[PDB]
Design a protein around this nucleic acid. Sequence first.
DNA 1: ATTATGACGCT
Length: 425
Amino acid sequence: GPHMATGQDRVVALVDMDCFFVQVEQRQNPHLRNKPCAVVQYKSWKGGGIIAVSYEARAFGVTRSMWADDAKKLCPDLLLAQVRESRGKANLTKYREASVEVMEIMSRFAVIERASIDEAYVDLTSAVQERLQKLQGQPISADLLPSTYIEGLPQGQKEGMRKQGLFQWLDSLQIDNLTSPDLQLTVGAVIVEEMRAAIERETGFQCSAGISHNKVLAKLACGLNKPNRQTLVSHGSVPQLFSQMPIRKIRSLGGKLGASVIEILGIEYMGELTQFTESQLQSHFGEKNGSWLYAMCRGIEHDPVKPRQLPKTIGCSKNFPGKTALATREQVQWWLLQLAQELEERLTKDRNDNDRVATQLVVSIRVQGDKRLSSLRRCCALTRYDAHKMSHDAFTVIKNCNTSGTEWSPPLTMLFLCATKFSAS
DNA sequence: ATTATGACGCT
Ligand SMILES: Nc1nc2c(ncn2[C@H]2C[C@H](O)[C@@H](COP(=O)(O)OP(=O)(O)OP(=O)(O)O)O2)c(=O)[nH]1
Ligand SMILES: [Ca+2]
Ligand SMILES: [K+]
């Protein structure tokens, strides 16, 4: 009882820009706004691969990783924006810069962990504490939560349902207790309304957010009510929420580990995990995964929000699928040079912006017919931001993969250069 | 012939 720590010490938020690349194109081109539209890469093969879909378009069944010519079968009025092409490859600079706009606004409110180009985690514990002192016992009005849902409420139309649930939550709230986790979450949610308002004011971008006591719950909460809405998942809401939550829906259980949890334990939903002892879970899935699962199925997770706003690596990738696979030496060299030239641009810009240099170059390749997604991964020293030297070094490091007797065999289906191991500058 | 990334764990 009094000694089971309940994982209620922190207020963590997960903010996620709704269909981010689509929003970036729709800010730049108003004719796309409030319309079924998607963002594609390339156009020749089946109209290009779709990588982002507005919610209007999603209502027609358009999804990511779907050819544009097929999405047009589901949605004949679909509008398409194309990713920039530079040096023969997709170039995602417009979106990295829009992402930095968003991240810099979020960093004004709290410390953020950049989880990907369009989502960040937020540690709000200090901010909530400050705000609770600033209220001086004043009760939190529903007007401060115009877009917040309270998961599991109401108990016992859609905006109506939302406001009913918020009303029940706020009526139950104990505002004189500056240490009640639920109050803390509620103030976190007010601050997240403010963050999202500032993001939309200052960028035009809308997002969704989850507010809970840890990153996994925040992330799960954020997906509950999209787009342009935020969701508070309280500790108390976890048993019901998890009682029908497929295991695959939890961050990091969507793959082979989730599938083996399901198969080995003979369960479907996250809450069923609570019936196993910690030792049992460790015995099946290893000591780290076991401990993490034992706590996570109880709503408890300790992974900190890392203070890291900038990416840890800067990478350049291109697949060469099917017949476009590279089969000559000139081909591999020219594409390694294209890759190294984009990477050098991004790296010099990073050095000027963020006062740091990369020190290690990683070269990954895939060879045709190889089952694995990386056929080889070798690193070398990165000592100057020079595209020609970088491409020469990558070739030097992969050349003993050619089995020909000017040809390249097996032909290459992927090149990949990554600058890593940053040091202050 | 979803592709372009990017974080992190394991050994
Ligand atoms: N090139 C490329 N970009 C991707 C891929 N997957 C996602 N992206 C880009 C486009 C998305 O807008 C953005 C963020 O990914 P998300 O999972 O958050 O989806 P998105 O923001 O589009 O939609 P959402 O509103 O969050 O459901 O990253 C991919 O496989 N390849
Ligand atoms: Ca998103
Ligand atoms: K994301």
